[PDB]
Amino acid sequence: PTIFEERHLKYISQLGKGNFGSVELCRYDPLGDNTGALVAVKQLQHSGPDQQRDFQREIQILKALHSDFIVKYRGVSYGPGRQSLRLVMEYLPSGCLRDFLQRHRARLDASRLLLYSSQICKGMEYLGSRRCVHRDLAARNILVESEAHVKIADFGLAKLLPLDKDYYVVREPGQSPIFWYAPESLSDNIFSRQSDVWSFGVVLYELFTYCDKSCSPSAEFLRMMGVPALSRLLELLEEGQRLPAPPACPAEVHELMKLCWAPSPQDRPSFSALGPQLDML
Ligand SMILES: CC(C)(C)c1nc2c3ccc(F)cc3c3c(=O)[nH]ccc3c2[nH]1
Numbered sequence: 205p206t207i208f209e210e211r212h213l214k215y216i217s218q219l220g221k222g223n224f225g226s227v228e229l230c231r232y233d234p235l236g237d238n239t240g241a242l243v244a245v246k247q248l249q250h251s252g253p254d255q256q257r258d259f260q261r262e263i264q265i266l267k268a269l270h271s272d273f274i275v276k277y278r279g280v281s282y283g284p285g286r287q288s289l290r291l292v293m294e295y296l297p298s299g300c301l302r303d304f305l306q307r308h309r310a311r312l313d314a315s316r317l318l319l320y321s322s323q324i325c326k327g328m329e330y331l332g333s334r335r336c337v338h339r340d341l342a343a344r345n346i347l348v349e350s351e352a353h354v355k356i357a358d359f360g361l362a363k364l365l366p367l368d369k370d371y372y373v374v375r376e377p378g379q380s381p382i383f384w385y386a387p388e389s390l391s392d393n394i395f396s397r398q399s400d401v402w403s404f405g406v407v408l409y410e411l412f413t414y415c416d417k418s419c420s421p422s423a424e425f426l427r428m429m430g431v432p433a434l435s436r437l438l439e440l441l442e443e444g445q446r447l448p449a450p451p452a453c454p455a456e457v458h459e460l461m462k463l464c465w466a467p468s469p470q471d472r473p474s475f476s477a478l479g480p481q482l483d484m485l
């Protein structure tokens with residue numbers, strides 16, 4: 205049931221890509237008549253041992269996650285051995301939240317944005333409870349199930365925290381747009397559930413700008429900046445500068461963003477603390 209046969213997965217189109225992987229829309233069509241169910245199918249773009257190890261980890265993480273706010277694992281297809289070839293997931297045709305917000309901005313009010321914020325927060329609370337650090341939380345990595353329901357996706361950079369250690373250090377600097385990283389990630393490559401909280405603050409920013417490109421984290425931080433861009437961004441953050449409140453943003457929401465962006469990770473609120481506050485608003 206959770207093993208999909210290669211010959212039955214029929215290629216339709218590209219959905220996305222990033223971090224050495226692609227996600228394709230396929231029909232799982234064992235009858236061959238174009239009547240089968242649609243699925244979203246992730247694979248490496250090309251072979252590589254480091255990326256294969258990371259891919260198997262992604263599969264193992266997602267398979268063990270069971271939440272209305274996390275994209276559903278369906279199964280896998282295999283290459284040669286037990287070598288995983290594809291990760292099969294539910295297909296959410298509304299696509300990523302970034303795209304959805306841009307398209308439907310004139311239809312989604314502040315209550316809707318708060319609903320999405322609450323749902324994302326609940327998914328992240330759950331992730332934290334599984335000792336999972338996502339590391340790449342952004343609107344482009346969140347999917348839309350319906351106009352009243354979003355789900356976190358993109359577990360390709362996620363890591364599980366050992367039982368005796370609440371952070372991890374990466375050896376190389378990351379390769380995602382720098383404007384979602386916490387200061388400690390920028391300076392020391394440290395990631396934690398608390399750096400996910402920082403990124404969630406940027407996600408709240410994105411929600412309340414409807415992912416408008418002109419005031420996006422990149423556009424606005426670059427404009428505020430004026431050494432290497434990473435060192436410049438780090439300086440800016442260490443001085444206390446932050447993204448400005450989005451146009452028409454409710455003050456209470458902006459205040460929560462600022463808490464998420466506390467300089468020190470131990471001073472940021474937990475997702476468990478943020479949830480009830482979002483629900484209140
Ligand atoms: C590249 C990235 C990992 C963010 C990703 N993009 C998508 C995606 C994009 C458009 C769309 F209509 C659907 C999806 C999608 C999906 O439907 N399921 C699972 C992952 C996934 C996805 N995963």
